[PDB]
Amino acid sequence: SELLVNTKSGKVMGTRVPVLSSHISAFLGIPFAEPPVGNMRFRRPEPKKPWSGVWNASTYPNNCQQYVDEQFPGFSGSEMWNPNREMSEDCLYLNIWVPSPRPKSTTVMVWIYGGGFYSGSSTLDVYNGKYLAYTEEVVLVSLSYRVGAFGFLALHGSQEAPGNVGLLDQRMALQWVHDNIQFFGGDPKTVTIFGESAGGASVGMHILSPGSRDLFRRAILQSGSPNCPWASVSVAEGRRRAVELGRNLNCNLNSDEELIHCLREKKPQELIDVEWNVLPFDSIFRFSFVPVIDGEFFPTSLESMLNSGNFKKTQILLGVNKDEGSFFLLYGAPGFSKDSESKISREDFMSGVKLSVPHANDLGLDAVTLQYTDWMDDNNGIKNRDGLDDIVGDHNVICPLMHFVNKYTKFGNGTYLYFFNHRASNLVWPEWMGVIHGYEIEFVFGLPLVKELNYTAEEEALSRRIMHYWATFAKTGNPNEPHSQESKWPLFTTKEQKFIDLNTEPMKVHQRLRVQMCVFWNQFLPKLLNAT
Amino acid sequence: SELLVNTKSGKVMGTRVPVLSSHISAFLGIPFAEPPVGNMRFRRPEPKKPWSGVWNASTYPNNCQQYVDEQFPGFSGSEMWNPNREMSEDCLYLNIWVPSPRPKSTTVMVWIYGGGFYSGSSTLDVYNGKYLAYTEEVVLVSLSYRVGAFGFLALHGSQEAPGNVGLLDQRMALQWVHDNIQFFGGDPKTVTIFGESAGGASVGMHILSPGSRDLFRRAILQSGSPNCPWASVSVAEGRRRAVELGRNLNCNLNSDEELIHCLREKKPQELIDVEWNVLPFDSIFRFSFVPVIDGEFFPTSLESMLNSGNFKKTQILLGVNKDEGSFFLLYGAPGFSKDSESKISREDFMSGVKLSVPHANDLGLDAVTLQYTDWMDDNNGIKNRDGLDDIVGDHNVICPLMHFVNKYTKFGNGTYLYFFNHRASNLVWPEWMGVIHGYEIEFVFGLPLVKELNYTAEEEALSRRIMHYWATFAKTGNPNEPHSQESKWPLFTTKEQKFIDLNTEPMKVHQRLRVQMCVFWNQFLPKLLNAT
Numbered sequence A, B: 001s002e003l004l005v006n007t008k009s010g011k012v013m014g015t016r017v018p019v020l021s022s023h024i025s026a027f028l029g030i031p032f033a034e035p036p037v038g039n040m041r042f043r044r045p046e047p048k049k050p051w052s053g054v055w056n057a058s059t060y061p062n063n064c065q066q067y068v069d070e071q072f073p074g075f076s077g078s079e080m081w082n083p084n085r086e087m088s089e090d091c092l093y094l095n096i097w098v099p100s101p102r103p104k105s106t107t108v109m110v111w112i113y114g115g116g117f118y119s120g121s122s123t124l125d126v127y128n129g130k131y132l133a134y135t136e137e138v139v140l141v142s143l144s145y146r147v148g149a150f151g152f153l154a155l156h157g158s159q160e161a162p163g164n165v166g167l168l169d170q171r172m173a174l175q176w177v178h179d180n181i182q183f184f185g186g187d188p189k190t191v192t193i194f195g196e197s198a199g200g201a202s203v204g205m206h207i208l209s210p211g212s213r214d215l216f217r218r219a220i221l222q223s224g225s226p227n228c229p230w231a232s233v234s235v236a237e238g239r240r241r242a243v244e245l246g247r248n249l250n251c252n253l254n255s256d257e258e259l260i261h262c263l264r265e266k267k268p269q270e271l272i273d274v275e276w277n278v279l280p281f282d283s284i285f286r287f288s289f290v291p292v293i294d295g296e297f298f299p300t301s302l303e304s305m306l307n308s309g310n311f312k313k314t315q316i317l318l319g320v321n322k323d324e325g326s327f328f329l330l331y332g333a334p335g336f337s338k339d340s341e342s343k344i345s346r347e348d349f350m351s352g353v354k355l356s357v358p359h360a361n362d363l364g365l366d367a368v369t370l371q372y373t374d375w376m377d378d379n380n381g382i383k384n385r386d387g388l389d390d391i392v393g394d395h396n397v398i399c400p401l402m403h404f405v406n407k408y409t410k411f412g413n414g415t416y417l418y419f420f421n422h423r424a425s426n427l428v429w430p431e432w433m434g435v436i437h438g439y440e441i442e443f444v445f446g447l448p449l450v451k452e453l454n455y456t457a458e459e460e461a462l463s464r465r466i467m468h469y470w471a472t473f474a475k476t477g478n479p480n481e482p483h484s485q486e487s488k489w490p491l492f493t494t495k496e497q498k499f500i501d502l503n504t505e506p507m508k509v510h511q512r513l514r515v516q517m518c519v520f521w522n523q524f525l526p527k528l529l530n531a532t
Helices: A130-136 A165-184 A198-208 A235-248 A256-264 A268-272 A302-308 A326-332 A346-356 A362-371 A381-408 A457-476 A515-531 B130-136 B165-184 B198-208 B235-248 B256-264 B268-272 B302-308 B326-332 B346-356 B362-371 B381-408 B457-476 B515-531
Strands: A004-007 A010-013 A015-019 A022-031 A054-056 A093-098 A106-112 A139-142 A186-196 A218-222 A316-321 A415-420 A498-502 A509-511 B004-007 B010-013 B015-019 B022-031 B054-056 B093-098 B106-112 B139-142 B186-196 B218-222 B316-321 B415-420 B498-502 B509-511
Touching (some): A004 A165, A010 A022, A015 A130, A093 A130, A093 A165, A106 A165, A130 A139, A130 A457, A139 A165, A198 A218, A198 A302, A218 A457, A346 A362, A381 A515, B015 B130, B093 B165, B106 B165, B106 B457, B130 B457, B165 B186, B186 B457, B198 B218, B302 B381, B316 B381, B326 B381, B346 B362, B346 B381
Parallel strands (some): A010 A054, A106 A186, A218 A316, A316 A415, B218 B316, B316 B415
Antiparallel strands (some): A004 A010, A015 A022, A022 A093, A093 A139, A498 A509, B015 B022, B022 B093, B093 B139, B498 B509
16 A cells, blocks of 8 residues: 555554645654653653554644744734644654655655744644645655753753753654655655754754764755854853753752752743743843754864864755844844834844844944944934844844855855745735745745645746755755756855845846855954954 | 335335236245254244344245155156255245235135145145135235154153144244234234145144134134044153154163254254154054144143033134045055056055054954955955055044044034045046045145146136135135025034035035944944954
């Protein structure tokens, strides 16, 4: 039977699903690790024990325990990102969409969801792999991993909460794909991992971490890189936040054992209710429990790894969205509102700058303000709004990714860069937010191909192009069709630094994506803060 | 006799001179102080002793002892600024151009020449007051003052070389105009002092210094202000340079008396030959002996005087030239040449930046470089050239003058600002130099009205407009004709900050003259250098 598969962990029973008036197979909720509950909380994941009988993989699994956004009850715009299944600590499962008839040895794509390392689910509607698996004929896999304190509590030096266990979760899911995808028709020597936001940062971390390098062939990073100021902390800051977490729940703090044990007796929602109280500064775009430079998963500091070429050399395709920051300003900066043009005063502008660059002294805050202010029109509400929007995106997503791509390209075997600047016609968020963080995802998964979702004809065409780029790159290491007649996505080189825009207009090639600012955020400011 | 005048110092005999096919009276070389020679060198000036008989004032006086530019032998471009008379320490004289028939009580204009406080003469062809006195019917006076070590050697604490004696020279010339101009037809209660470069800086210093405030009514400042980074030094740096001067001439350095005496036995050219060896840094646009904040001429620091409103309140008219820096780059920065387009490499660019901001640490040099570089075209030879040109002008002339005008306007009784951006059609300097430092002078003195000099018709028209503005402002405190139909030069206010361009095109009003950079040079950089 096409829906029955015999893996090294036991038999699995999938289900048939309709897609664009056709059908493909889907194996939902396959376990890849033992449930990380009770004594296992905060602990490294263990391989799932083989099982007899047939595993029913016809329905989505639960979502990991996480913080749930309630800033806009009912609003589809924000609820489409919330967990759509019962949350549970028993969350380590993966999903597979296989073409029909079943392939013999085709290209594999493993998706890693984003969510600031504090949220995310593989089961969201925007992550339905059926459209992509169907249209491009690839085996699509979406894994899951623990988030928040459950996957990133770090008390370096102990084995009960070593840290980075959330990344080990992803690595284990990849280990399973490596050992079993052949039974689903996938080629294990041709797996491409791709993700967005924290997922894009995760993908870059597997490229850097020695223990993950051999588990995949290529990588796609969307709006996120391993060296983002929010994606990781020192073992010291990790320890500091873990303890403060314990202090908010009145736990015995005399020893790691004392603290960990107390945290293991707590109900999931009890740790989530106080999770945001441990941040060191009043800030925007910063999260409590994230990966930590421990000397294990990451041998040394990330910057020295990037300079010494200490990372997997292969091809990578990555890019960013035009307005990466508007989302975090809406939820956390004074002056912004979902229902207004949000014109910002000088007052709120400088107030927002303090929230965006939390680790900066006054001299630094002044440097940023000078770099993003037009003194010929300093009280222009729309210029201060977009200025604040650029700052948040540049510092948190764009400038950090450009530093990675430039460091990587010096040792890699091929880089392809894009700038996504098309605002979907059906977006429910206000206009001032522009091309929002995470909204290029829907084009990657092909949602525009389904009429009932209401996209335009040009938006459907754009989705097929992107899907064909991502898929063609996954298979060959180049997003372009060998002998095509279409426009060529030029390769990004240390010298030219070419990149393309991704929208519904005739492709255009550009150079040096936001260099002026990237030099400010990657060369000048760091130096300023270190001297002063 | 129209050419005979009886002043409080004695009788004076002038000469008749032709101008634009007419005639006016000229009294050249009238003494206003005793010759500052021998024991008087470096000493404060003394009033000239009255004389019997008639003083022959029909020929120009000598020029003060000074450094002479020989970088381009024969080249009119640079020699038109060199002394055109025998140099001598006996140099304190003034020149007066009086309309014919002699006025009864008309507006007076006293010109103070520029030259970095190390050069200058009242007798240059470009400073011939006859055209202006004739065309606008005003009494025109040009004074002289000691420059270089002769007028600025400063050994605070002693009375033999107190410092600022060069400024006291100007003040004395003004004292004479105040006590005697009435006998030449001038109104002593309506004297306007105006100058360019160091002369513009001098004018601003008389506005600040308590002892000079009552000697004039209004002031015009061209391309120079009292707070320019090159116009003054601390008593300590003054003392340091005076001593180093003595060390270059092998003088006994055990005491001020020892040093001063040794410097007084030296021939003029001996001090001039080593004058440039005392600068503290390898630099561009910096001079050895300049005014010093001594607590006498200047009560306190200049910045505190400007903030407390401690200065003469009146009307002022001032502005700058488009390309104030090209002249100092030509003579002192690697890469620039009089006979080439001078395209600058990245190498020379950063090299020039080090020479332009001599007192800056590496962090500061990097701030400037980032502020003036276009990272999308960083190896563009023409962009690095103009970038270096803007830096020198902004830091040395434009940003400092904007700080003054903004501080002054808060307490003054009327400010008028201009931006001169017309390059004369007969300039002998290369094109890359643009609207050069000091070339607005020729329009102020009316040289374009004389056919044989070869200006265009629009350039002659521009000269009459400027002459009428300067003269109409000198008489009324407003450059505009009461009920004219022409375009109005709007008043500069703290709020709007309006200013006009000065060229051969239909007047246009603008706002916030180079604010972006002025905020960098007046607010950010100072702060950066002080924190680091």
